[PDB]
Write a protein that binds this DNA or RNA. Structure first.
Length: 138
DNA sequence: GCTTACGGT
């Protein structure tokens, strides 16, 4: 079952559709910042004032950081692009030191947890709520 | 795993 990002909670696995606002690969991991244009009280509040001008996403508590490790790194780092849509499945959630909720795709070569992330074609009807809610927001 | 809400690799 899928959840809107508004609905998800830390230390409970979740699946959701989202649009990618930001990517950044590093020597340690691959990070995404994603939104479905629903607000979560535990998300980081992005400032309209100090955010990078490149930030093509919403402000306030409307996006979430996703850390991708290992196999998830290697798969996505030169594949998932900013603006792309994704479905993420049975990902783990946790907080950072300041209490902000984020999600994590950790190593799992045994696939114990049935984790997956895959691109969704822009025209798929599954993305329609995201597109409308963006309207509402914009 | 994670100091970051940057960069453009």
């Amino acid at each position: 079952s899928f959840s809107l990002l508004s609905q998800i909670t830390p230390h409970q696995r979740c699946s959701f559709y989202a649009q990618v606002i930001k990517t950044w690969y590093s020597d340690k991991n691959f990070t995404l910042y994603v939104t479905d244009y629903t607000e979560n009280e535990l998300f980081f509040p992005m400032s309209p004032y100090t955010s990078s001008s490149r930030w093509r996403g919403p402000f306030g508590r409307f996006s979430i950081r996703c850390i991708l490790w290992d196999e998830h790194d290697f798969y996505c780092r030169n594949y998932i692009k900013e603006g792309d849509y994704v479905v993420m499945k049975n990902v783990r959630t946790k907080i950072d030191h300041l209490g902000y909720l984020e999600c994590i795709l950790h190593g799992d070569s045994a696939k114990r947890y049935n984790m997956s992330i895959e691109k969704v074609d822009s025209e798929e009807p599954e993305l329609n709520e995201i597109k409308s809610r963006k309207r509402l927001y914009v």
